[PDB]
Design a protein around this ligand. Sequence first.
Ligand SMILES: Cc1cc([C@@H]2CN(C(=O)c3ccc(F)c(F)c3)CC(F)(F)C2)n2ncnc2n1
Ligand SMILES: [Mg+2]
Ligand SMILES: [Zn+2]
Length: 342
Amino acid sequence: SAMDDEYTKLLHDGIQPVAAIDSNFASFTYTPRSLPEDDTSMAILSMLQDMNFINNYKIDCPTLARFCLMVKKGYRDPPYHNWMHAFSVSHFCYLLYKNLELTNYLEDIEIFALFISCMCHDLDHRGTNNSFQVASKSVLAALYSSEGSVMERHHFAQAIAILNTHGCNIFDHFSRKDYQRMLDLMRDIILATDLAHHLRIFKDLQKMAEVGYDRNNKQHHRLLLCLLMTSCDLSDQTKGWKTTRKIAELIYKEFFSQGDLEKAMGNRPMEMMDREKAYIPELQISFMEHIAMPIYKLLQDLFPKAAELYERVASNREHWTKVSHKFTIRGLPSNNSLDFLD
Ligand SMILES: Cc1cc([C@@H]2CN(C(=O)c3ccc(F)c(F)c3)CC(F)(F)C2)n2ncnc2n1
Ligand SMILES: [Mg+2]
Ligand SMILES: [Zn+2]
C-alpha cells in the first residue's frame, strides 16, 4: 500500500527537473548520498528524462515508475550494499553521460543499458561476498557456483525477475532484437561488477587505452562498458575525504559482520574481514593503490576530462597515510583507563 501511494505520486505528479534536485547535481563534486533516500526514485526519473531515454525509447511512464520502485525495494539494508549504493552508482553513470560525451564512444542503447545496469547491479545483496556464498553453501552458490560471480549472477537474475513482473517490463515494446540486446548488455555489465572480472580484463583495458579507442571495434565497446561500470561502482572514492571516510566505515562494518559469521562457522576470515586483524588505513591505502587508482588512471587516459576523478582518488589515498598515526593509542584512552588491556 505504501508502495502504491509512492507509485501514485511518482506517476501523476510529474518528473522534477534535474536542476531542482541540486544546483551542482551534474558535477563530479556532487555527493549523491546527500540526497534524502525518499527523493531518490524521483531523481532516477529526472536523470532518465534528462538523458532523453524516456522519449528516445518511448518508455511507458506507469511501467517506468513501477520498475524504479521495484528496483529500490529489491535492495536490503546492509551497511554498504544497499539502495543508496545503487543510487549513487547510477548517479555517477549520469555524471559520466553529462561530463564525458559518451555518445562519441558508445551506442545509445549501450549507454541506456549501462544506467539501468547501475540501478540493478547489486539487487538483493545480503552483505556477504562470493567466497562466503560457497563457504556457507548458500542457495545462490548452489545455483551459480559452477559459473563463478555468484552474487553478480544473482543480481542479474533479480533484475530479470523484476522485468518479468507484470507491469514492470520497461523494454517490452522493444523489437525482439533490441530486447535481446538490452538483456545481453545487462548481463555483461552486471557481471563486470565482479572485481575478479575487472582484474582479469585489466591488461586488455590497458591495451585498449594504449592503442586508442576504436569506436568501430565491438570488443572496445564491451571493454569500455566494463571499465565505466567499475568506475561507477567505485565512484564513492572520487568524492572528498568525508565521503570516503564514511564509506570506509560502511564497508568495514559490512566486512566485519561477514568475518564474525565465518568465525562462527569455524573458518579464518580474510584479514580485511577480521575485526581483530584488519588495520583500516593500510587496507584503504592498498585498495586505493592497487585497485581504485589504476581504474581512474585508465579512465583519465581514455577521457582527459576524467583527470579530476583520478586526482581525487590519489588525494584520498594520501589522506589515509596522513591520518594513520591516529589509529595508534597515545597517552591514555579518553577514560584514563587501561581496562581495555584485559
Ligand atoms: C567504493 C569502495 C568499494 C569497496 C569494495 C571493494 N571490494 C573488494 O573486494 C575489496 C575491498 C577492500 C579491499 F581492500 C580490497 F582489496 C578489495 C568489493 C566490494 F566489497 F564490493 C566493495 N571498497 N573497499 C574498500 N574501500 C572501498 N571503496
Ligand atoms: Mg556488487
Ligand atoms: Zn556495487
